[PDB]
Amino acid sequence: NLCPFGEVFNATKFPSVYAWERKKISNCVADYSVLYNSTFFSTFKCYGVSATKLNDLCFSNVYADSFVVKGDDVRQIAPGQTGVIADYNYKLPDDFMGCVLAWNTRNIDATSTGNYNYKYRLFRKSNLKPFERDISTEIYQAGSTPCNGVEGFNCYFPLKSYGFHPTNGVGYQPYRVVVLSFELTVCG
Amino acid sequence: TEENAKTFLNNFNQEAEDLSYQSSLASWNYNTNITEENVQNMNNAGDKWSAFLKEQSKTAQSFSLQEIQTPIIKRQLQALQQNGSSVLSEDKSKRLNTILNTMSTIYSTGKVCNPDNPQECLLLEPGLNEIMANSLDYNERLWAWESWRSEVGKQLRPLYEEYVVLKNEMARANHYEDYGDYWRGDYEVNGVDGYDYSRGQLIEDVEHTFEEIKPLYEHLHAYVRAKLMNAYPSYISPIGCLPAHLLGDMWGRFWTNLYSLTVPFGQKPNIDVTDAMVDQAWDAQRIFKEAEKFFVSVGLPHMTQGFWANSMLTEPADGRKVVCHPTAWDLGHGDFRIKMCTKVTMDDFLTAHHEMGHIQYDMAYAAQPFLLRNGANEGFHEAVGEIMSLSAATPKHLKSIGLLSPDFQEDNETEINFLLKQALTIVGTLPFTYMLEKWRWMVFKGEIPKDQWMKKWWEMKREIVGVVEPVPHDETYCDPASLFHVSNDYSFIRYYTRTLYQFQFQEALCQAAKHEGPLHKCDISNSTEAGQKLFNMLRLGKSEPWTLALENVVGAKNMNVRPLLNYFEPLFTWLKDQNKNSFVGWSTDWSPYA
Numbered sequence: 001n002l003c004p005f006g007e008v009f010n011a012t013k014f015p016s017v018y019a020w021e022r023k024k025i026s027n028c029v030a031d032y033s034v035l036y037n038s039t040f041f042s043t044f045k046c047y048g049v050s051a052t053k054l055n056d057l058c059f060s061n062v063y064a065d066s067f068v069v070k071g072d073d074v075r076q077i078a079p080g081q082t083g084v085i086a087d088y089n090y091k092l093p094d095d096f097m098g099c100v101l102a103w104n105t106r107n108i109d110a111t112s113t114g115n116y117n118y119k120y121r122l123f124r125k126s127n128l129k130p131f132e133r134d135i136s137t138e139i140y141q142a143g144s145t146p147c148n149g150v151e152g153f154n155c156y157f158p159l160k161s162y163g164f165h166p167t168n169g170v171g172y173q174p175y176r177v178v179v180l181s182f183e184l185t186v187c188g
Numbered sequence: 189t190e191e192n193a194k195t196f197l198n199n200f201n202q203e204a205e206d207l208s209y210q211s212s213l214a215s216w217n218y219n220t221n222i223t224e225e226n227v228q229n230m231n232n233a234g235d236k237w238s239a240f241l242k243e244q245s246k247t248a249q250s251f252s253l254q255e256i257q258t259p260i261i262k263r264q265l266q267a268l269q270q271n272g273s274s275v276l277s278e279d280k281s282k283r284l285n286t287i288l289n290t291m292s293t294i295y296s297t298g299k300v301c302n303p304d305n306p307q308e309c310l311l312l313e314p315g316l317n318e319i320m321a322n323s324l325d326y327n328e329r330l331w332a333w334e335s336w337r338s339e340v341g342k343q344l345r346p347l348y349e350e351y352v353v354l355k356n357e358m359a360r361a362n363h364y365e366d367y368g369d370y371w372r373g374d375y376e377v378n379g380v381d382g383y384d385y386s387r388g389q390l391i392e393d394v395e396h397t398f399e400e401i402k403p404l405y406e407h408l409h410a411y412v413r414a415k416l417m418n419a420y421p422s423y424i425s426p427i428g429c430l431p432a433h434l435l436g437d438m439w440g441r442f443w444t445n446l447y448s449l450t451v452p453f454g455q456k457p458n459i460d461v462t463d464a465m466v467d468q469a470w471d472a473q474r475i476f477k478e479a480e481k482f483f484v485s486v487g488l489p490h491m492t493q494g495f496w497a498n499s500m501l502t503e504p505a506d507g508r509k510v511v512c513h514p515t516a517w518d519l520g521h522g523d524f525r526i527k528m529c530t531k532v533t534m535d536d537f538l539t540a541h542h543e544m545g546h547i548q549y550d551m552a553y554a555a556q557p558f559l560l561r562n563g564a565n566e567g568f569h570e571a572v573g574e575i576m577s578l579s580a581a582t583p584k585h586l587k588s589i590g591l592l593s594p595d596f597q598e599d600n601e602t603e604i605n606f607l608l609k610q611a612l613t614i615v616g617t618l619p620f621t622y623m624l625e626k627w628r629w630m631v632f633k634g635e636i637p638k639d640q641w642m643k644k645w646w647e648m649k650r651e652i653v654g655v656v657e658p659v660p661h662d663e664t665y666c667d668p669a670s671l672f673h674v675s676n677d678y679s680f681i682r683y684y685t686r687t688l689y690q691f692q693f694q695e696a697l698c699q700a701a702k703h704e705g706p707l708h709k710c711d712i713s714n715s716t717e718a719g720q721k722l723f724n725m726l727r728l729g730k731s732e733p734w735t736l737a738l739e740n741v742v743g744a745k746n747m748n749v750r751p752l753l754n755y756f757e758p759l760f761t762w763l764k765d766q767n768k769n770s771f772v773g774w775s776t777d778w779s780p781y782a
């Protein structure tokens with residue numbers, strides 16, 4: 001059977017980067033022809049494997065990570081980055097083997113009144129381990145005073161909204177990202 | 189408490205960028221519409237941005253500036269730590285905002301009527317400004333000059349009196365001498381060894397550089413005066429000051445309109461490509477397409493697609509009221525626009541390079557944090573736009589674009605004609621700018637009492653600018669407030685510093701552009717070295733001190749007047765030869781009514 005790549009790429013709703021979702025790909029044959037012969041993608045950057053030799057290859061299982069970041073934040077979805085998204089939202093291992101795919105979604109993910117649905121984590125104690133996921137909305141304590149539930153001075157909410165307006169620049173427009181991880185069932 | 193401040197500054201950058209964008213986009217809909225519904229959205233979104241800035245102002249003042257070690261984080265806290273207009277009471281702030289809005293209104297809504305024809309009533313723009321720029325009748329110009337200062341000037345007199353005392357009450361509460369010291373604080377750098385600059389140092393540097401401008405201006409004043417006597421015989425003394433209503437505009441700020449009366453060699457063809465582009469079928473999009481090509485030739489990036497779609501590059505060609513003042517908008521979020529009712533003229537072609545120069549500055553420092561996305565000082569932004577119009581106005585560039593004929597001979601007289609037109613605009617405004625800001629500095633400092641505001645105003649006009657009033661004014665008039673920048677609460681010393689900056693930039697870029705001829709014939713086109721040399725300062729924004737940003741391009745830690753004199757050096761020697769049988773200088777005692 002064909003692997004359901006349309007359920008992640010052509011998905012209607014895409015998650016925020018802080019709460020990115022993962023989908024495991026088990027016994028099914030892959031079809032990377034769908035991914036390459038399209039001008040729909042903005043990046044399509046592979047690490048550890050090539051964008052062509054993957055057709056005649058087999059893996060134990062494939063993991064697909066999906067989320068949404070701004071244009072300037074796409075650069076952080078790569079091994080060895082230290083931005084806000086890479087450190088507090090989604091980190092890739094140094095020995096990552098896969099491909100990162102992203103495309104512009106200004107017409108569907110940016111509304112005139114401002115789409116504040118897509119969020120990201122701005123404050124967190126220490127950085128995330130590779131493939132770690134944090135959905136805690138606990139008040140970040142930046143000082144020595146206990147926050148005691150309420151925000152205020154030195155106590156900020158960890159999640160902030162992107163705020164995608166359709167008149168923004170390309171560096172501030174919404175981009176849907178799909179990270180395909182390869183682990184060593186799935187063949188071409 | 190340094191890491192406690194870094195997280196605080198990040199909660200601001202990711203929250204202010206959204207509120208400023210909503211306020212900027214709201215104010216765009218007003219200058220692009222002009223309705224009552226859109227004027228409220230500008231004020232509604234404006235108070236929310238102000239109220240957010242006030243919360244972050246006081247909550248940033250709890251962070252002791254001395255406790256910060258990393259200096260990039262240091263300058264960001266001082267930017268937020270501003271009480272602003274809120275240090276006044278709720279009644280003082282409403283009255284201060286009431287007079288500031290009332291003054292801007294009477295300036296834009298004030299209209300004078302002709303006593304000879306009472307049905308003919310004209311406001312400043314385009315009514316009175318067209319008279320002061322084209323009319324050759326002494327009484328008609330005297331009427332427009334005096335009616336503007338006797339009608340709308342006297343109404344601003346009681347409002348400007350309270351404006352001085354209320355604005356001083358704000359600055360003195362924020363550890364400043366007066367409101368003039370508050371404006372001079374834009375050039376203050378304090379913390380970096382070898383690049384510091386005090387607020388009092390500005391007064392010393394502006395006056396030191398102005399002494400070297402006196403010789404060039406005195407010869408220009410003597411040359412213009414000789415030509416003006418032929419235009420207004422039996423009205424000007426060959427040894428006295430120039431009447432204020434004969435200078436080319438309402439205030440004498442620019443002598444550009446005197447070119448038809450002061451042209452050195454009128455027989456030579458004028459370089460006005462206005463009719464050329466009209467015949468070549470040029471629209472506003474063609475003007476900006478060529479301006480875009482100019483910045484690409486030096487290595488800078490192109491214009492965003494949102495610029496070519498959301499900007500207002502032409503007249504409101506449908507049903508909407510619009511202010512046509514050319515402005516360059518940096519709304520943030522990568523949204524860069526230009527509002528300009530462009531017409532198929534040469535003056536709009538050069539202005540398109542100026543306004544797009546502002547955008548290239550905004551695009552460069554976009555990677556900097558929010559509080560650092562601005563010019564080095566108040567004069568850096570206008571200087572960047574002016575160096576583009578300097579290169580775009582050279583005959584070498586106009587011929588390469590296609591606006592001048594390829595067989596246009598550039599004689600030594602065509603260059604003196606060009607430099608003279610430049611001097612009427614560039615060097616002609618320097619004594620006016622300095623004298624104006626010097627008068628407000630003294631008023632704010634408390635050196636000019638109220639009972640001699642206008643008396644001391646014209647004593648400086650005669651001595652510094654060399655301009656005498658045509659009719660006597662008591663303290664009931666308020667001629668300085670009759671200018672936009674004075675009655676609309678804007679500092680004016682920025683135009684003096686930007687003038688010296690643009691020629692330091694031009695000389696520095698033309699050296700990187702490997703130019704060899706005169707400085708006024710330089711075009712920094714194709715020069716990736718000059719573009720990289722300029723981009724190295726545009727990317728800095730307000731992170732590095734302006735003394736350091738200026739040094740990254742010109743190699744100097746302070747403003748210098750030598751590049752300004754080198755630009756007009758061929759013209760300065762020509763004026764001395766023309767004034768060999770004329771009187772260079774002016775007597776501060778002659779008046780057209782003694």
Ligand SMILES: *[C@@H]1O[C@H](CO)[C@@H](O[C@@H]2O[C@H](CO)[C@@H](O[C@@H]3O[C@H](CO)[C@@H](O)[C@H](O)[C@@H]3O)[C@H](O)[C@H]2NC(C)=O)[C@H](O)[C@H]1NC(C)=O
Pocket residue numbers: 482485587588589713714
């Ligand atoms: C550096 O920037 C300048 C503009 O500031 C460029 O000069 C102009 O470049 C264009 C494009 O190559 C030339 O256009 C072509 O001109 C010929 C002759 O008129 C015409 O047959 C073509 O159809 C096209 O219009 C343009 O003439 C030229 N301006 C001149 C020579 O006055 C320059 O190319 C830039 N780059 C380089 C590598 O120099």
Ligand SMILES: *[C@@H]1O[C@H](CO)[C@@H](O)[C@H](O)[C@H]1NC(C)=O
Pocket residue numbers: 220221222223224225226507508
């Ligand atoms: C101007 O504003 C009115 C509401 O005040 C709106 O109906 C109209 O569409 C606006 N026009 C343009 C061109 O934005």
Ligand SMILES: [Cl-]
Pocket residue numbers: 439667668
């Ligand atoms: Cl005046």
Ligand code: NA
Pocket residue numbers: 321322323445446448449
């Ligand atoms: Na005239």
Ligand SMILES: [Zn+2]
Pocket residue numbers: 542543546569570573
């Ligand atoms: Zn400008």
